[PDB]
Amino acid sequence: DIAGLTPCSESKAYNKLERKELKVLDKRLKQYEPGSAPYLALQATKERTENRFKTYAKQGLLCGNDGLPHLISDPGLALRFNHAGEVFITFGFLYVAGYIGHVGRQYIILSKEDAKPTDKEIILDVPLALKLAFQGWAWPLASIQELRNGSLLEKDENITVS
Amino acid sequence: AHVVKIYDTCIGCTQCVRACPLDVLEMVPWDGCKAAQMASSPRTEDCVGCKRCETACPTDFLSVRVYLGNESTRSLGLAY
Amino acid sequence: DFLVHHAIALGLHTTTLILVKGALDARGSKLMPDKKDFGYSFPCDGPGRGGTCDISAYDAFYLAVFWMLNTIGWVTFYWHWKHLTLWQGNVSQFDESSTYLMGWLRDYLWLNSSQLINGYNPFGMNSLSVWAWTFLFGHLVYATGFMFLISWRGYWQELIETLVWAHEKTPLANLVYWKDKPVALSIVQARLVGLAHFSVGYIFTYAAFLIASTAGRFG
Amino acid sequence: EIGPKRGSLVKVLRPESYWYNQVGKVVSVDQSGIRYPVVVRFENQNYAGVSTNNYALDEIEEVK
Amino acid sequence: KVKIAVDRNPVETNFEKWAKPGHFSRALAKGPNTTTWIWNLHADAHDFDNHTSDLEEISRKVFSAHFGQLGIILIWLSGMYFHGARFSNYEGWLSDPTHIKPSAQVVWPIVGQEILNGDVGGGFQGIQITSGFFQLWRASGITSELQLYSTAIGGLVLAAACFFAGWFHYHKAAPKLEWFQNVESMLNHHLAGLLGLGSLAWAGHQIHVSLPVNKLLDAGVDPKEIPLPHEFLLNQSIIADLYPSFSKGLAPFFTLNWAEYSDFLTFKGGLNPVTGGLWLSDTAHHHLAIAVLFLVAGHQYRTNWGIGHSIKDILESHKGPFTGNGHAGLYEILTTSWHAQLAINLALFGSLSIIVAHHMYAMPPYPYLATDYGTQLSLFTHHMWIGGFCVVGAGAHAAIFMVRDYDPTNNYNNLLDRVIRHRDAIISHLNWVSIFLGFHSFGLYIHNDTMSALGRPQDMFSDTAIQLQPVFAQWIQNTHFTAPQLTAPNALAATSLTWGGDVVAVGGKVAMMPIALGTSDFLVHHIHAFTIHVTVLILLKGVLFARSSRLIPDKANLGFRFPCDGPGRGGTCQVSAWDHVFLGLFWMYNSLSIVIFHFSWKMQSDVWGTVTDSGVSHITGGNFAQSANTINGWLRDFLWAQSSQVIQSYGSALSAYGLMFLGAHFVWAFSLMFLFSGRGYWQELIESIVWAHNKLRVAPSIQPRALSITQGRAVGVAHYLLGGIATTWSFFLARIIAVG
Amino acid sequence: ASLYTHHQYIAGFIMCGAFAHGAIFFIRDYDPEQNKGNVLARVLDHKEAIISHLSWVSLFLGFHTLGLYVHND
Amino acid sequence: MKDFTTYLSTAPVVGLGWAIFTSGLLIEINRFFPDPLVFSF
Ligand code: CLA
Ligand code: CLA
Ligand code: CLA
Ligand code: CLA
Ligand code: CLA
Numbered sequence A: 001d002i003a004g005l006t007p008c009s010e011s012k013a014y015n016k017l018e019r020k021e022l023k024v025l026d027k028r029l030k031q032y033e034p035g036s037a038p039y040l041a042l043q044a045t046k047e048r049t050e051n052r053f054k055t056y057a058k059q060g061l062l063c064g065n066d067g068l069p070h071l072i073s074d075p076g077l078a079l080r081f082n083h084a085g086e087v088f089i090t091f092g093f094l095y096v097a098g099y100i101g102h103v104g105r106q107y108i109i110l111s112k113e114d115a116k117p118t119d120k121e122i123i124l125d126v127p128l129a130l131k132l133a134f135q136g137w138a139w140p141l142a143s144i145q146e147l148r149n150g151s152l153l154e155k156d157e158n159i160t161v162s
Numbered sequence B: 001a002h003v004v005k006i007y008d009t010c011i012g013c014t015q016c017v018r019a020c021p022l023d024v025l026e027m028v029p030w031d032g033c034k035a036a037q038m039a040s041s042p043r044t045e046d047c048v049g050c051k052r053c054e055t056a057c058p059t060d061f062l063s064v065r066v067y068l069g070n071e072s073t074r075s076l077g078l079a080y
Numbered sequence C: 001d002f003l004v005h006h007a008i009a010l011g012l013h014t015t016t017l018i019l020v021k022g023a024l025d026a027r028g029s030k031l032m033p034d035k036k037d038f039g040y041s042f043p044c045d046g047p048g049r050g051g052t053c054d055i056s057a058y059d060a061f062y063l064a065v066f067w068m069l070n071t072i073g074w075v076t077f078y079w080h081w082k083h084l085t086l087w088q089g090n091v092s093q094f095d096e097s098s099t100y101l102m103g104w105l106r107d108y109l110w111l112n113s114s115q116l117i118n119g120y121n122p123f124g125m126n127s128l129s130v131w132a133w134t135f136l137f138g139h140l141v142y143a144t145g146f147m148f149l150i151s152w153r154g155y156w157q158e159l160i161e162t163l164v165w166a167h168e169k170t171p172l173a174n175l176v177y178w179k180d181k182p183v184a185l186s187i188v189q190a191r192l193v194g195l196a197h198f199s200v201g202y203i204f205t206y207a208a209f210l211i212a213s214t215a216g217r218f219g
Numbered sequence D: 001e002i003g004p005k006r007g008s009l010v011k012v013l014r015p016e017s018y019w020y021n022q023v024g025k026v027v028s029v030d031q032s033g034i035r036y037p038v039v040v041r042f043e044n045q046n047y048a049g050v051s052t053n054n055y056a057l058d059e060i061e062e063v064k
Numbered sequence E: 001k002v003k004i005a006v007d008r009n010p011v012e013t014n015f016e017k018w019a020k021p022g023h024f025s026r027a028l029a030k031g032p033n034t035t036t037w038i039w040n041l042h043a044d045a046h047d048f049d050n051h052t053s054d055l056e057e058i059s060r061k062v063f064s065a066h067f068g069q070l071g072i073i074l075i076w077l078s079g080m081y082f083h084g085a086r087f088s089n090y091e092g093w094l095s096d097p098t099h100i101k102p103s104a105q106v107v108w109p110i111v112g113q114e115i116l117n118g119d120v121g122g123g124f125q126g127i128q129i130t131s132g133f134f135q136l137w138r139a140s141g142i143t144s145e146l147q148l149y150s151t152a153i154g155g156l157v158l159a160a161a162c163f164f165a166g167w168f169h170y171h172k173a174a175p176k177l178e179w180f181q182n183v184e185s186m187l188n189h190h191l192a193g194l195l196g197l198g199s200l201a202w203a204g205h206q207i208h209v210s211l212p213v214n215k216l217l218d219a220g221v222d223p224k225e226i227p228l229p230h231e232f233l234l235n236q237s238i239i240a241d242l243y244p245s246f247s248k249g250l251a252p253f254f255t256l257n258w259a260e261y262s263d264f265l266t267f268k269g270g271l272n273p274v275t276g277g278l279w280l281s282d283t284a285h286h287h288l289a290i291a292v293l294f295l296v297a298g299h300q301y302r303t304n305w306g307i308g309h310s311i312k313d314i315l316e317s318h319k320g321p322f323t324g325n326g327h328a329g330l331y332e333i334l335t336t337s338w339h340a341q342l343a344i345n346l347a348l349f350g351s352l353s354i355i356v357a358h359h360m361y362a363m364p365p366y367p368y369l370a371t372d373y374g375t376q377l378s379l380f381t382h383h384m385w386i387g388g389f390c391v392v393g394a395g396a397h398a399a400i401f402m403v404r405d406y407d408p409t410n411n412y413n414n415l416l417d418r419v420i421r422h423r424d425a426i427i428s429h430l431n432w433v434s435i436f437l438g439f440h441s442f443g444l445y446i447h448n449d450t451m452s453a454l455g456r457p458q459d460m461f462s463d464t465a466i467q468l469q470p471v472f473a474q475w476i477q478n479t480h481f482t483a484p485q486l487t488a489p490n491a492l493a494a495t496s497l498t499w500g501g502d503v504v505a506v507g508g509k510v511a512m513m514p515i516a517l518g519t520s521d522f523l524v525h526h527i528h529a530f531t532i533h534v535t536v537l538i539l540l541k542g543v544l545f546a547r548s549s550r551l552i553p554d555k556a557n558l559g560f561r562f563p564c565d566g567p568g569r570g571g572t573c574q575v576s577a578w579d580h581v582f583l584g585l586f587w588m589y590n591s592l593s594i595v596i597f598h599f600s601w602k603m604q605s606d607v608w609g610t611v612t613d614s615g616v617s618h619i620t621g622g623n624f625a626q627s628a629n630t631i632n633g634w635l636r637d638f639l640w641a642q643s644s645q646v647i648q649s650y651g652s653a654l655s656a657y658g659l660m661f662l663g664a665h666f667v668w669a670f671s672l673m674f675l676f677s678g679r680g681y682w683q684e685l686i687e688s689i690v691w692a693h694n695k696l697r698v699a700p701s702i703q704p705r706a707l708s709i710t711q712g713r714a715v716g717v718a719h720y721l722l723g724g725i726a727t728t729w730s731f732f733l734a735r736i737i738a739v740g
Numbered sequence F: 001a002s003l004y005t006h007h008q009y010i011a012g013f014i015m016c017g018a019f020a021h022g023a024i025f026f027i028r029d030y031d032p033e034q035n036k037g038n039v040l041a042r043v044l045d046h047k048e049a050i051i052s053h054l055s056w057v058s059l060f061l062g063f064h065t066l067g068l069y070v071h072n073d
Numbered sequence G: 001m002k003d004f005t006t007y008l009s010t011a012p013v014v015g016l017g018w019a020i021f022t023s024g025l026l027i028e029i030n031r032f033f034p035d036p037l038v039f040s041f
């Protein structure tokens, strides 16, 4: 009940929308036999809709004036209340993104220490790429240990015109 | 017309005189390169500005430069 | 308003990127180090070294005018829709239909344009007809600007040469002659005329729609 | 004799060249008193497509 | 002299060349120093003329590529048959063609996506198709899905055979140049064998298997009780019951008493009143005549038996007084260059596709096709776009030939030399005609716009006020209507119901209603003529000036696909022949969009609709004559009045069309970024990003360059055409499916 | 509405002109020997850093605003 | 055999190995686990 919003568990617009979708899906049930493939498909879609509304609700998710769930993003404001899960868990993307970056940077540096590193880019060295992909699980430790040693950057060896 | 200039970083490969389609550049003797010849441009009034000499220049940076300027009947490539 | 504010931030940073890059890399770059010796508005530096089309700072500003127009169009679309939904007591329309772009195109560009295009139909006309006329006039100016933006000078130079031959070898019209030789517009001039046509159409079309859609259903 | 050792990697110091602050291998050094006798060769091509250029004696520095 | 010259085992079959990606050209074998090497590798993959100058090697490469294309087409055709066999509702649609909508694609329920599986009727749900495959499968008898399954399997077998044939003819038995240069033999076998035997075999299929659709399926017989097609082929009594002439048994054919086969070889001018399409007996008699015509046509040229003609002699025997020599080296031009033949073939192929588009909506040939507005509008629009793309390609390859394979030695005073000699007169006249058509065809629209805006509706070009009537087309329509009474006595009625007076309707919906012409038809026809003239102006200028212009006299040595010739002479950007094709592509899009818009609005406002007891009511309000005279009428009554289905399409079954609509708009808006900007800006921006990567030592080994000057133009025109065409596609499909 | 739209479009054109004249200043009257090592010559030394960070911010906002809009759509 | 396995390292290793793996992983996650708008905390 922050930023003027209300929990999805006590909102009339949320229930109104839920019944609307359950009704528009149920209107298509009369056009088919009670035991065929379109009937089974429509029944599976109805079960998924009921489960999603139940899953979206009772999990601290709150909506505002229209039944649509809103998301709290300020840390602290999302930590003082049970709203950390909605967007404060940015560390999942940061982990996968840093994993991709560390694997690519390790492949660029290692491949450059070879005669003509070009054809190694158009024709990947798959045993070296697979070995470097499964070796970068602890990428933040390698990043902090490669920064203190100064092996992450260059001093002044850049094609500049400044 | 356009102003063409030839800098001292020329190597005398004679490629700009071969790439010029209006006979603007020439090769004069010089004593500052291995080929002992440097390009020149006596017929500057016939420069059209297609910049083929700059593409034919192999040194970095280009020894020949075509600075565009005022246009005349010859530099505008008009046939009428 | 969150997403629209982020769209405004995107437009501001992109226009600033184009203008700041064109200002800092104005006196030289690695592709052309003696750019400062060529002035501020030159066509290019030939098709050599890969090609140097649109390399001057004038060209960079030219490219930034489009981004400025897009950013101002986004901020004015946002302002007009929020006030358009607040003035009619239907503030819940924009708040629930402004999240998706289809909602933007339907409830903003398609719904508020019902009275503008009805300025003149086969059943007569009304006060909004002048706005309806200039609403299409802006579209025509915009489309003419796309011509100078897409088509480049060499194609037009050959075309003008054929027209010169036609006027010289034709009877009863060869008596007159041009005092100055006809030639195609230059590369920089073509970019400037196209930008002027693009900006004029972009301004006239939105002014017509804004005044008509507001004047048409309000006071 | 006046230029660097043939076959030694050097660094370019021409502020308007495409290989500024780069490392190139010296292929030959002329001994005729010309303005730019140190000829170098680089692994990466320039915007035009060439990969070699000749520099002077003052615009050539040893690598790191 | 005509023999089979084959050269066995010329190229090994290994994967050694698959290792090195750039190997066909001598320039890409050095490897990829800059990112432009990847784009060069893709753009030079099929330019066989750049691979070598060996005409025999070039001919062998194109001969194997043809087989690869045939295998790809056969795989696609087999896929359509398999989808109609397993993931469709063809059996349900076969018993109710006027109430169940076609569907041959089912989507899996992953993220949402159940909504796309729309209820098409018949106890089935899937994507509604607009290809007309069900109507085609109805036209040639096909009852169950086992026949569609067998057709899919047989086509896959033929596809594997075509791929094997390509590998065989390029690696195991390659032909020779003396084998490829037998144009008389190729024309004789393509006219006599391919077209003639194809029409004869299809006539035989329509004479024996297309029997349920012409006699039992249309009579209301349930498709399960219909005898199998082989029963009609073996049992003569079961076919004699349907058509009594079959009781004669090849006797009137050989005894020249063809009048006895008058029941299954009819000449009925019209449509079937139960299905809406042409009569199957008429289409069968049609194919039989075409087969005889082509079989007698394939015996014109001389090959190895003396009798016949010589194409070189026929060309050299045509010399007139206004063309100097004329047709002197045309045989040498057409027998040694592939681009010349490709330009001629592409031009006639695209024009043929446009003919197909007109005749299909005019005379509907499939059962229950005219009452399926979605498939009708879809087929017309698709064939029109394919035809326009092919004509622009013809204009491209003619310039390619003129730049590469044009030798000014074998052409001294022929038609090609004379045409290149008065190119200035040709281009100047086409220029004037273009401008005149533009003023007289667009100023009328702008004039009606100003007259309607100023409050003066009596001063505009309309039917009520000052009019312009297309009297020539009105007279041709009248001639075709009253033609089966005097100039076609054996024909039962007119060849089409487009100019008639009898509206036919199947299932309550109109099939083919007479079409009237007024002032708006005159205005839109002049609009079409104007856009066609501008497109032909851009293409013809490019071809005639691709060799050497008066501005740039050495344009031939510069190549075909080049950026410009520097900023000299004020500027020479896009002066190459390739650039003219790029400009042409744009004008072809602008022309065909107006053509398909005119078709959709005219059909929806004057032919299609639904008939009741108190008259016929069209789809729209019949506002084609009172709303097409103004530009505001189009933007208001066509794009704004229609497209409301596309706009309100969210949450429905056709929800993908709104997404495709918005998505197509983004691609078109994305094309402008590549089309207005240059290259130096992007190269300097890429330089700054390279500095950022060098600071962290993530500099790519292959230095990252910007796109080429011609690559940026190519990317921009591809994105522009994709966005505009996909926008019109989503709009047309959603509107006609939700309305028709 | 007309006053707000008018003032915002005028402000956009003037803002583009400011940067245009800054580029004209750098090309026409910027002598590097006069102000050596100051802030004007110092911001020119890391122009690649400034331009690259502007490129990163623009790419971030574009990718995410377009992605959120298309996802909701 | 060496030429075939080295041919398989140019464009398929990046456009059909990773694309198929990533697409299949995201699709199977969204198939067994239905539609995820929060961390379910
Ligand atoms: C091709 C486009 C086109 C055409 C055909 C017309 C035609 C017409 N307009 Mg018009 N108009 C147009 C575009 C066009 N307009 C546009 C774009 C606008 C908006 C700017 C307007 C705005 C407009 C207004 C405001 C008005 C008209 C009016 C008229 C009518 C009388 C105008 C007039 O002065 O008579 C024609 C005068 C001429 C000098 C015509 C010359 C004819 C030439 C010489 C062809 C004949 C010779 C030819 C070359 C044959 C060759 C012979 C050989 C021996 C060489 C007329 C039928 C008036 C009207 O009331 O309508 C009824 C009127 O008030 N128009
Ligand atoms: C709708 C048209 C359109 C679009 C989408 C863009 C998009 C972009 N412009 Mg641009 N521009 C346009 C029109 C457009 N422009 C026009 C008309 C002009 C005037 C000529 C300009 C002039 C211009 C300049 C001068 C510059 C830009 C820049 C940029 C980039 C800004 C970075 C960003 O915002 O993050 C990304 C925003 C996006 C919208 C990304 C689009 C890609 C999405 C993710 C789709 C991905 C495809 C998907 C994975 C499927 C791929 C498969 C497919 C190939 C089959 C961006 C990609 C600036 C730049 O380079 O930034 C560094 C810059 O310098 N533009
Ligand atoms: C793994 C390689 C790699 C790495 C470590 C980086 C790292 C970086 N890039 Mg970058 N980039 C890459 C590849 C890479 N890039 C490629 C292939 C392109 C061409 C599409 C770009 C184009 C690019 C631009 C235009 C910009 C950056 C920028 C940046 C910096 C800002 C952070 C960011 O995520 O920006 C965004 C990165 C991207 C949008 C690229 C995403 C595409 C994927 C991740 C690359 C695929 C890599 C491949 C899988 C590795 C092979 C693995 C190996 C085992 C075979 C950062 C240091 C920004 C900058 O200037 O610095 C501040 C910037 O503006 N990059
Ligand atoms: C009467 C004999 C005959 C027949 C039926 C054909 C038929 C065909 N020829 Mg061919 N041709 C023939 C004789 C014949 N040719 C002779 C004698 C010569 C030497 C002068 C040529 C030289 C020739 C060339 C140079 C080319 C063709 C091509 C083609 C194909 C055109 C594809 C098309 O447009 O759509 C029609 C498509 C179909 C009808 C699908 C049918 C597919 C089946 C498998 C075709 C089988 C017919 C085959 C000729 C049978 C004999 C071969 C046998 C050993 C198996 C087509 C299948 C083009 C091609 O190669 O395309 C691959 C082409 O480039 N022909
Ligand atoms: C071009 C395609 C085509 C085909 C394939 C057929 C085929 C057929 N028609 Mg026909 N027809 C056609 C077109 C065609 N028609 C057209 C265009 C018309 C005019 C509109 C007609 C009008 C017509 C009439 C009026 C009749 C037929 C009839 C027939 C059937 C018997 C005819 C017959 O006995 O002749 C002769 C058959 C042969 C000489 C046999 C061919 C020799 C065999 C295949 C050799 C194989 C031997 C091999 C060496 C060894 C065997 C292998 C073994 C060891 C495994 C037959 C199935 C009759 C019918 O209705 O049938 C019930 C009949 O009444 N047709």
Ligand code: CLA
Binding pocket: C140, C142, C143, C144, C145, C146, C147, C148, C150, C151, C159, E431, E433, E434, E435, E436, E437, E438, E439, E442, E443, E446, E534, E537, E538, E583, E586, E587
């Ligand atoms: C709406 C935008 C637009 C417009 C109006 C035009 C207009 C024109 N284009 Mg064009 N073009 C465009 C976009 C546009 N283009 C784009 C985006 C591209 C990129 C693909 C091209 C590429 C292109 C090419 C390659 C060519 C043209 C050509 C032409 C001219 C052909 C003339 C003609 O036959 O018709 C008639 C002309 C008109 C109808 C112009 C409108 C005039 C109206 C009627 C006003 C009437 C006069 C008015 C009353 C007087 C005003 C009074 C005022 C002074 C106070 C024409 C003037 C061709 C050409 O040069 O001509 C041979 C040519 O080859 N265009």
Ligand code: CLA
Binding pocket: A091, A092, A093, A095, A096, E111, E112, F063, F064, F066, F067, F068, F070, F071, G029, G034, G035, G036, G037
């Ligand atoms: C960049 C913009 C953007 C963003 C932010 C999102 C975000 C989201 N989209 Mg969306 N989408 C987008 C663009 C975007 N989309 C576009 C452009 C389209 C059109 C193509 C779509 C179409 C679309 C559809 C159709 C759907 C979504 C859905 C979703 C939600 C899916 C959550 C999920 O994937 O499950 C979870 C995924 C994973 C867990 C991946 C696993 C990765 C590895 C294995 C785990 C990571 C490591 C782990 C965290 C451990 C780290 C340790 C650490 C703590 C240290 C999510 C909130 C779905 C939804 O449910 O809507 C709410 C869905 O239906 N999107």
Ligand SMILES: CCCCCCCCCCCCCCCC(=O)OC[C@H](COP(=O)(O)OC[C@@H](O)CO)OC(=O)CCCCCCCCCCCCCCC
Binding pocket: E318, E319, E320, E321, E322, E323, E324, E326, E327
């Ligand atoms: C309906 C199609 C368009 C209508 C208007 C077409 C006119 C515009 C172009 C004319 C350019 C004139 C230069 C001719 C160039 C020329 O003189 O070529 C020469 C030709 C005579 O040449 P020879 O006899 O020497 O040629 C013999 C050998 O070359 C044989 O290959 O004369 C003609 O073409 C007569 C036809 C005049 C024009 C007839 C129009 C042809 C269009 C199709 C037929 C239309 C008939 C009426 C149908 C309505």
Ligand SMILES: CC1=C(/C=C/C(C)=C/C=C/C(C)=C/C=C/C=C(C)/C=C/C=C(C)/C=C/C2=C(C)CCCC2(C)C)C(C)(C)CCC1
Binding pocket: C023, F018, F019, F021, F022, F023, F025
């Ligand atoms: C008190 C207050 C506050 C605060 C505020 C502040 C802190 C301020 C500001 C502000 C700002 C911060 C502003 C600004 C802006 C800026 C701009 C807009 C810019 C610019 C620049 C330019 C445009 C440049 C040009 C040039 C160049 C390019 C280079 C050199 C030369 C020249 C200079 C010419 C607050 C809100 C919290 C609250 C309320 C009150």
Ligand SMILES: CC1=C(C/C=C(\C)CCC[C@H](C)CCC[C@H](C)CCCC(C)C)C(=O)c2ccccc2C1=O
Binding pocket: C147, C148, C151, C152, C153, C154, C156, C183, C184, C185, C186, C187, C190
């Ligand atoms: C059509 C066209 C031409 C030809 C255009 C010409 C010759 C323009 C002249 C036609 C008439 C005279 C224009 C009418 C003038 C205006 C109505 C008023 C201008 C007067 C103001 C200065 C007051 C080019 O020169 C060109 C150059 C570079 C890229 C694209 C193109 C291009 O597309």
Ligand SMILES: CC1=C(C/C=C(\C)CCC[C@H](C)CCC[C@H](C)CCCC(C)C)C(=O)c2ccccc2C1=O
Binding pocket: E673, E674, E675, E677, E678, E679, E682, E706, E707, E708, E709, E711, E712, E713
């Ligand atoms: C933007 C632009 C560039 C820059 C073009 C570039 C940098 C090409 C970009 C190619 C990209 C990298 C291809 C791959 C696209 C995406 C990475 C695909 C997304 C896939 C994700 C799922 C990973 C030009 O070089 C150019 C040249 C001439 C006229 C106009 C332009 C022009 O407009």
Ligand code: SF4
Binding pocket: B004, B019, B020, B021, B022, B023, B024, B025, B046, B047, B048, B049, B050, B051, B052, B053, B054, B066
């Ligand atoms: S720009 Fe062209 S005409 Fe002038 S000197 Fe260079 S090559 Fe010759």
Ligand code: SF4
Binding pocket: B006, B009, B010, B011, B012, B013, B014, B015, B016, B017, B038, B039, B053, B056, B057, B058, B059, B062, B063, B064
């Ligand atoms: S092309 Fe350049 S280096 Fe060669 S002669 Fe001409 S100016 Fe000198």
Ligand code: SF4
Binding pocket: C043, C044, C045, C046, C047, C051, C052, C053, C054, C187, E563, E564, E565, E566, E567, E571, E572, E573, E574, E678, E709
């Ligand atoms: S602007 Fe024109 S002349 Fe200059 S490089 Fe580009 S295409 Fe060539």
